[PDB]
Amino acid sequence: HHLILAPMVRVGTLPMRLLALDYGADIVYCEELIDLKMIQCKRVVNEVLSTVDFVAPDDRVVFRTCEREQNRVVFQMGTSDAERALAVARLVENDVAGIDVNMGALLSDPDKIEKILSTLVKGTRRPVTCKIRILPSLEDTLSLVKRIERTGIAAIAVHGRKREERPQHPVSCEVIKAIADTLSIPVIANGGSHDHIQQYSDIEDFRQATAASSVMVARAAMWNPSIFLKEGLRPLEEVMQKYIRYAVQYDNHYTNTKYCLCQMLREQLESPQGRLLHAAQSSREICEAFGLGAFYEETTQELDAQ
Ligand SMILES: Cc1cc2nc3c(=O)[nH]c(=O)nc-3n(C[C@H](O)[C@H](O)[C@H](O)COP(=O)(O)O)c2cc1C
Numbered sequence: 001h002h003l004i005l006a007p008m009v010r011v012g013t014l015p016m017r018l019l020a021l022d023y024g025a026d027i028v029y030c031e032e033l034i035d036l037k038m039i040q041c042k043r044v045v046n047e048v049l050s051t052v053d054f055v056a057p058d059d060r061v062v063f064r065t066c067e068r069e070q071n072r073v074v075f076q077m078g079t080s081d082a083e084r085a086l087a088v089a090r091l092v093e094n095d096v097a098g099i100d101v102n103m104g105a106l107l108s109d110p111d112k113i114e115k116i117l118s119t120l121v122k123g124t125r126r127p128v129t130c131k132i133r134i135l136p137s138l139e140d141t142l143s144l145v146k147r148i149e150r151t152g153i154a155a156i157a158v159h160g161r162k163r164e165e166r167p168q169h170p171v172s173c174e175v176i177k178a179i180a181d182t183l184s185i186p187v188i189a190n191g192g193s194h195d196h197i198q199q200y201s202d203i204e205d206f207r208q209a210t211a212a213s214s215v216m217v218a219r220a221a222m223w224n225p226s227i228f229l230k231e232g233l234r235p236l237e238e239v240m241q242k243y244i245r246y247a248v249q250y251d252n253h254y255t256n257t258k259y260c261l262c263q264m265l266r267e268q269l270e271s272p273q274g275r276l277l278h279a280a281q282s283s284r285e286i287c288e289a290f291g292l293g294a295f296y297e298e299t300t301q302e303l304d305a306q
C-alpha cells in the first residue's frame with residue numbers, strides 16, 4: 001500500500017523528508033551518505049533543535065534525524081566494504097527505521113554485494129534494503145535479484161533502467177514485474193517519474209503496471225512534494241513556504257535549502273521570486289524572498305537562546 005520517498009543526494013535532507021511525510025509518504029529514504037564519512041562521525045543529541053545529529057571531525061552535521069520520522073526514515077549508505085558498512089549501521093541503527101545500500105559499480109560484483117548485505121542482516125536488527133538498477137540481460141538480472149534475496153534483506157527496490165541508460169529512455173515496467181513475481185520479498189517499483197507519474201493516482205497505476213508491492217518516487221517528489229497527497233497537488237507557493245519553514249526550524253544550511261527550492265521552481269526561476277532566491281546569500285534572504293522574514297526572526301530568536 002506504501003508510498004515511499006526515494007533516496008536523493010542533496011534533496012533528501014531532513015526538511016524534504018519531513019515535508020514528504022506531511023503530504024502522505026509512508027517511508028522516507030535519506031540521501032546517499034558515504035561510509036567513509038559516516039565512520040568519522042560522532043552521535044550527538046541536539047536538545048536545541050530536538051534532533052539526533054551525526055557530526056564529522058570538521059564539526060559539520062553529516063546526517064540529521066528527529067523524532068517525527070524515527071519510525072519512517074531509511075538510512076542509505078554508499079559502501080564497498082562489509083566491515084565499514086556494519087560500522088555505519090551500528091552508528092545509526094538506533095535513530096532510524098531501516099538501512100539501505102546503494103547499488104547504482106558495486107552492482108558488478110555479486111560476491112561483494114552478498115557479503116555486505118548478509119553482514120548487515122546478521123549485523124543489525126533493522127530491515128536491510130537495497131536499491132539496484134537492472135542488468136542489460138534479463139537472465140542475469142533475475143539471477144542477481146535471487147542471490148540478493150536469500151541474504152535475508154527485507155526488500156529490494158528496482159530502478160527499471162540499465163546502468164548507463166539515460167533517464168529520457170522509458171522505464172521497463174516489464175522487467176520490474178518479472179522481478180516482483182520471482183521474489184518472495186517485497187519489490188519496490190522505481191523509475192516512473194514524468195513518464196508515468198505526474199499526479200497522485202498515477203502511482204497506484206505504476207504499482208499495477210509493475211506488479212510491485214509499493215512505489216518509490218524521486219523526481220516527481222523533488223518537483224512537488226505534495227505528489228504524495230491523494231486529494232491532489234498543492235500550489236507550488238504553498239509547498240515552498242512549507243519547505244522553508246522546516247528548513248529554518250531544523251537549521252538546514254541555506255545552500256541546501258536554496259538548491260531544493262530551485263529544483264522546485266525550475267521554469268519559474270525567472271520570476272522575481274526566483275531571481276531573489278538565486279541571489280540569496282543566507283536563510284534570512286531566502287525567507288525574505290518568500291515573505292517569511294517575520295517567521296525567520298521569530299524562530300531564530302528562540303533557537304539562538306539555546
Ligand atoms: C537529484 C537526485 C539525486 C539522486 N540521488 C540519489 C541517491 O543519493 N541515491 C540513490 O539511490 N538514487 C539517487 N537518485 C536516483 C533516484 O533515487 C531514482 O533512482 C530515480 O530518480 C527514480 O526515477 P524517478 O525519478 O522517475 O522516480 C537521485 C536522483 C535525483 C533526481
Ligand SMILES: [Cl-]
Pocket residue numbers: none
Ligand atoms: Cl485549494
